Amino acid sequence: ITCYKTPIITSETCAPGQNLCYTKTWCDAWCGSRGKVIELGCAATCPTVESYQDIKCCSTDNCNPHPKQKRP
């Protein structure tokens, strides 16, 4: 699959075996001013996260865009 990858948005092929994309977020000490921190990448199985983090996996090419891109 292809997925979006942090740190400076690009779309790349995941290694064989990885058939999902993920979006992982979490607050920071600067969350109210700056917003959540977001991480994007490839995954073989959806990553387990810590109780203070959130994750959402998908399975279609480039399905995890940064919510601030170029389009519409």
Side-chain angles (χ1 to χ4, degrees), residues 68 72:
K68 284 301 174 298

Side-chain angles (χ1 to χ4, degrees), residues 36-59:
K36 311 230 281 111
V37 351
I38 83 331
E39 179 194 324
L40 304 178
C42 286
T45 123
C46 200
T48 49
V49 298
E50 294 315 323
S51 137
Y52 67 100
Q53 276 168 177
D54 283 310
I55 189 134
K56 188 117 189 99
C57 284
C58 54
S59 59

Side-chain angles (χ1 to χ4, degrees), residues 4-56:
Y4 283 109
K5 295 227 211 32
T6 192
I8 149 234
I9 335 313
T10 47
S11 174
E12 257 210 276
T13 308
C14 310
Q18 324 208 289
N19 299 312
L20 307 165
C21 298
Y22 70 80
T23 302
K24 147 126 107 134
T25 58
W26 72 86
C27 260
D28 251 63
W30 281 283
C31 219
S33 35
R34 308 177 76 212
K36 311 230 281 111
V37 351
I38 83 331
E39 179 194 324
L40 304 178
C42 286
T45 123
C46 200
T48 49
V49 298
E50 294 315 323
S51 137
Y52 67 100
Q53 276 168 177
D54 283 310
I55 189 134
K56 188 117 189 99

